[PDB]
Amino acid sequence: RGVYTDYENTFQRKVETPMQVHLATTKDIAILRSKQWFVLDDVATPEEFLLGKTLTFRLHTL
Amino acid sequence: DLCQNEPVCADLNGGLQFIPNLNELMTRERKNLTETSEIRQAVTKETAA
């Protein structure tokens, strides 16, 4: 209990919900591949490799 | 003067009669426009959001 203004040691580790998104359309995948943070692994994997797929997202946020 | 000889049939169609399945072609091209438009618009809207 108290008033604290020291933010230098403040952090939060969160295991995010295992989320799902289904890429029914090219548009969804273009939307996805717009994201620079969406770093494809095997980049030679086609965009429409993901077409009609539910991508599952396991994420941690610090 | 020619019409006084015989009825005249003037084809001013520009060759449309030589295109098979004009309706399907038209429907496809109307789609082609729309897709391209939508993609840029979706990117724009997402960029805004």
User: Please, which residues bridge with residue A15 across strands?
Assistant: A60
Residues of A at the B interface (Cβ-Cβ below 8 Å)?
A: 26-27, 30-31, 34
This structure's resolution (Å) is 4.5
Q: Rounded CA gap, A26 and A19, in Å?
A: 20
Taking the C-alpha atoms of residue B5 and residue B8, their distance in angstroms, rounded to an integer, is: 9
- Strand, helix or coil at A47? helix
| Owner of token pair 């946020």 | A61
Residues of A in contact with B43 (CB under 8 A): 30-31, 34
Asked if residue A58 lies in contact with residue A14, where contact means CB atoms within 8 angstroms, the answer is no
Q: Which chain B residues have a beta carbon less than 8 Å from that of A31?
A: 42-43, 46
**Furthest CA-CA distance within chain A:** 55
Q: How was this structure determined?
A: cryo-EM
Select the residue from A23, A27, A47 to test the B interface by mutation, using most B Cβ atoms within 10 A. A27
